[PDB]
């Protein structure tokens, strides 16, 4: 009754639905806590990440850096494969993928540069060939430059700069953090206070309005205690903006319009600690002495409830939900609550290979100085136990185990982890994604299915900027691990393969293993 190709198409349709039923983040990070890790040696074929190459800082940048009179700073434009260095009032960009790069110098600025960022342009403003806007903040003003990052035959963007006549006086508030939205909105913050500013700009000059303006969205007044920002974070999928303060206060702002920004949540460390105390498992790794060192937004495509990850200096990952009071009038949330905690692993890095309760006391990630999360959960933590050498903890969801876990009530935040050692003197500065953002589906269910996209998009790669160079870290897929493991079985017995294969079956299941 039903011919071959139609029968096989039925199998495809049911297989597509099976891959798109991969558990969403909310489902395996339910209220509670977890310490589930399988640690892998960095030199193992089972390593979830590994360093593929490194790019030294050009010698000319070292000449300028050591010629610094007062202030210097480094940063990453990982989206286009560029890095930058500021020396006092001078800025230098370069393509770090190029073996002998030329330095793009920009020295028009009159005062010390305090922040630099590469953001999308405002639509309908610039010629289509302008791909980005370069924001340069000094102690006196903020400067906008047009950017065209067109790809070259070699695979590294060609960068040319355009003047704009767009600039505004800074004012009294320091600018150390610049972030941009998908639509080209530019937000500013710094180390003077917790105020958030926005830069507006338009093509036409008017007699009653300049081409470029600046406004303070915080509208402060009266008595104000000392407090400033540690970072700004954007989530376009929810039209939200987050700030982290030096007191570990998390503020949430909603973009109710193309020119509006409204503060809708303010959650201090005490509130986080109160939520934590109401959880079943309390821990000495999170107290009133603990600092939150970084935030990472979680987009709505990845999870409905969990909006935000917060990293403590003890290495705890705090996952916070946010909820609106109502269901209709984007809808702004009005509450934020600490729901789930991923506690640190226990295994420390070792030169020699060393040999079920919730582990809520590990110090392996203490102190955590910098932290980053990328969908579907790739986690980088800069652990600074010693003041000269950084250790990099890198982990990923155990996609294979999460996909096979049954029933749904048994789902936990299983992870594969590893330690990547940086040489003595390497101080990590920034980590950015070099490939396209990960997404296996368009909604939380199916979103995190790494297995499904092994052959549709290249493995994620991450540029780790240090004070000596840029290191490229690459995510390894099942097929990469399987191929590497088999490569070690080439010189062994019939039973040597069967043993290695059984490791894969016990983690990924038989079908996924045979498919690899």
């Amino acid at each position: 009754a039903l011919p071959p190709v139609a029968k096989a198409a039925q199998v495809v349709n049911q297989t597509l639905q099976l891959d798109d039923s991969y558990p969403d983040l909310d489902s395996y990070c339910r209220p509670g806590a977890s310490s589930d890790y399988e640690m892998q040696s960095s030199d193992s074929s089972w390593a979830p990440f590994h360093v593929v190459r490194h790019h030294n800082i050009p010698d000319k940048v070292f000449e300028h850096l050591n010629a610094g009179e007062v202030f210097t700073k480094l940063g990453l434009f990982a989206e286009i494969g560029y890095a930058w260095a500021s020396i006092d009032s001078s800025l230098f960009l370069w393509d770090y993928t190029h073996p002998n790069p030329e330095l793009i110098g920009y020295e028009e600025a009159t005062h010390t540069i305090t922040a630099v960022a590469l953001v999308p342009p405002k639509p309908g403003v610039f010629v289509k060939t302008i791909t980005h806007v370069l924001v340069v903040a000094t102690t006196s003003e903020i400067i906008l430059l047009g950017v065209s990052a067109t790809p070259t035959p070699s695979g590294s963007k060609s960068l040319t700069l355009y003047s704009t006549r767009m600039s505004v006086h800074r004012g009294g508030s320091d600018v150390s953090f610049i972030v941009g939205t998908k639509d080209g909105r530019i937000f500013l913050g710094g180390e003077s206070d917790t105020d958030i500013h926005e830069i507006f700009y338009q093509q036409e000059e008017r007699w009653f309005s300049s081409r470029c303006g600046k406004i303070n969205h915080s509208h402060p007044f009266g008595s104000r205690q000392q407090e400033w920002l540690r970072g700004l974070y954007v989530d376009d999928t929810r039209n939200l903006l987050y700030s982290l303060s030096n007191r570990s206060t998390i503020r949430t702002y909603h973009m109710e319009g193309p020119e509006k920004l409204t503060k809708v949540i303010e959650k201090d460390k005490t509130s986080c600690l109160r939520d934590f105390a109401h959880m079943a498992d309390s821990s000495p790794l999170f107290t009133d002495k603990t600092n939150i060192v970084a935030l990472s937004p979680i987009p709505a495509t990845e999870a409905s409830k969990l909006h935000l990850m917060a990293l403590t200096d003890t290495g705890c990952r705090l996952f916070l939900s946010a909820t609106s009071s109502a269901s209709y009038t984007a809808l702004a949330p009005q509450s934020m609550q600490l729901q789930f905690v991923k506690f640190p692993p226990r295994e420390s890095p070792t030169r020699i290979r060393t040999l079920s309760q919730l582990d809520k006391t590990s110090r392996a990630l203490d102190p955590s100085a910098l932290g980053f999360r990328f969908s579907p959960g790739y986690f980088f933590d800069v652990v600074r136990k010693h003041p000269n050498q950084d250790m990099l903890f890198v982990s990923a969801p155990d996609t294979g185990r999460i996909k096979v876990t049954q029933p749904a009530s048994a789902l936990k935040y299983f992870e594969q982890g590893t330690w990547i050692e940086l040489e003595n003197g390497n101080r990590t500065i920034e980590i950015g994604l070099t490939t396209a953002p990960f997404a296996a589906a368009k909604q939380p269910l199916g979103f995190g299915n790494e297995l499904a996209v092994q052959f549709d998009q290249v493995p994620g790669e991450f540029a780790v900027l240090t004070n000596t160079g840029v290191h490229i870290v690459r995510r390894r897929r099942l097929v990469d691990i399987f191929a590497k493991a088999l490569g070690n079985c080439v010189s062994a017995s019939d039973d040597a393969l069967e043993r290695e294969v059984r490791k894969f079956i016990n983690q990924y299941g038989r079908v996924e293993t045979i498919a690899a």
């Binding site: 028009e108 610039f126 040319t160 355009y162």
Partner: peptide, 14 residues
């Protein structure tokens, strides 16, 4: 080498 800054005329339309 100081980067050549092409003019605003090309940059913004129309």
């Amino acid at each position: 080498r100081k980067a050549k800054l092409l003019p605003m005329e090309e940059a913004l339309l129309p």
